[PDB]
Structures are given as structure tokens and as C-alpha cells.
Amino acid sequence: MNKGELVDAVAEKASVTKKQADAVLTAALETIIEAVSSGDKVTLVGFGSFESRERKAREGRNPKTNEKMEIPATRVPAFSAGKLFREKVAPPKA
Amino acid sequence: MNKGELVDAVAEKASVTKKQADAVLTAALETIIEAVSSGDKVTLVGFGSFESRERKAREGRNPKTNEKMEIPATRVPAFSAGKLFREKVAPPK
DNA sequence: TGCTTATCAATTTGTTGCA
DNA sequence: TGCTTATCAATTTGTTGCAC
């Protein structure tokens, strides 16, 4: 499923124009990236959460020269799937 | 930012009602979950992708009893943030 | 787009049951 | 989403640059 296909399904499910599903979806994703980038957590009950995670510096190694090197500290976006998402993907047994 | 707060923000940018932002967002999340649960990859240009990952069985331990246990194989949802998302969080160079 | 070095290395997550 | 086990064990990601 791409963005186009998702819009198709959404426009159908929510009874909005394929434009509007696209309009609202694009703004939603753009907003999530914005909130995460300025360090807010985006929380969507059942689905999951998105946040920025700190990554400390660590050592790597150059595969060409074998030289040890330092990967500097960074931040990365992170997703944690909510309980409904996890259980649809893996229906509980025990 | 929670669901209710994201919907408010998106009704504004797209120029709809709150009720349409919400019904669109809800539909989109349910569709992604369904797509992923059925083994489909959801790929959204300018945001990232969602997919199912296989996890082999592994060893854990019971905190109540201290007995070793086997956590069975399963499937888990995974998100891979797109380049744009990654670069907004951590500007290059 | 893979695939790629290190006898890597910082990281995530799951395991009970109750609050 | 907390604390609460293992002197856990499995994941992921990154390090460079080619065409494997």
C-alpha cells in the first residue's frame, strides 16, 4: 500500500473526497514530523507513539581502512506500536 | 500531542471540520494496521514505512519464579522513518 | 538499492502480575 | 506506562563505498 492507495481506502471509509483524504493525511504526517522534530511525543491510543530518541556517540570502524572511528551523538525518530496494533499483527494465544 | 490534538491541528491546515480530520485520521490508522497485519508494507512518501517483522523464539525469565522460559516466535509491527523525517530530527552535517 | 568490517557497540525489548 | 529478574538474549543501527 502506498500513499495513493491509503487515500483511496480512507476516502471510502470516512466518506471524504480522494483529495480531502489526501489533504488531511498529508497534513497529519507533516504535523507528526514537526512535533517529533521539536521534541514532542505524538501519542495515538491503540496505534502507537512517535518520539525523538537521543543516541550517544559510539565507536564504529571504517570497512575500507579498518580504522576505528567515532559515530557522533545524534537524535532519531522512534515508533512504539500500541497494544491494538501489536495484537492485530500477533493475535494473543497466551 | 495526542490524537485529539493532532486532529485539531490537521482540520486547520487542510481547511476541513474537526469531524472530518478525525474520521480521515481514524480510517487511515485502522487501514495501516489492517494492511500490516495482513503482511502488506505501507509506504508513505515523505514520512516512512510500516511493516510486519518476524521474531524467532527466544529465552526470557519469569520474574515471579526465576524460571527460564521460551518466548514463542511472533510477528511485530515496525516503522522505518523516511529520509525527510530523519533529516528534520537530525539536520545533516 | 543491497551487501559490506568488527572475534564491534550503543540500543531495544520481552519475560509476571499488580498499581 | 510504573516497578519488578537475568552476573539475560535477541534486535537494530551505524561505520564506507562498490556493483558482489
Swiss-Prot record, chain A:
Molecular functions per Gene Ontology: DNA binding; structural constituent of chromatin
Gene Ontology annotations of biological process type: chromosome condensation; heterocyst development
TM ranges: none
Gene Ontology cellular component annotations, sorted alphabetically: cytosol
Subunit structure: Homodimer.
UniProt similarity note: Belongs to the bacterial histone-like protein family.
Protein function: Histone-like DNA-binding protein which is capable of wrapping DNA to stabilize it, and thus to prevent its denaturation under extreme environmental conditions. It is essential for heterocyst differentiation.
Name of this protein: DNA-binding protein HU
Species for this entry: Nostoc sp. (strain PCC 7120 / SAG 25.82 / UTEX 2576)
Species classification: Bacteria, Bacillati, Cyanobacteriota, Cyanophyceae, Nostocales
Gene that produces this protein: hup
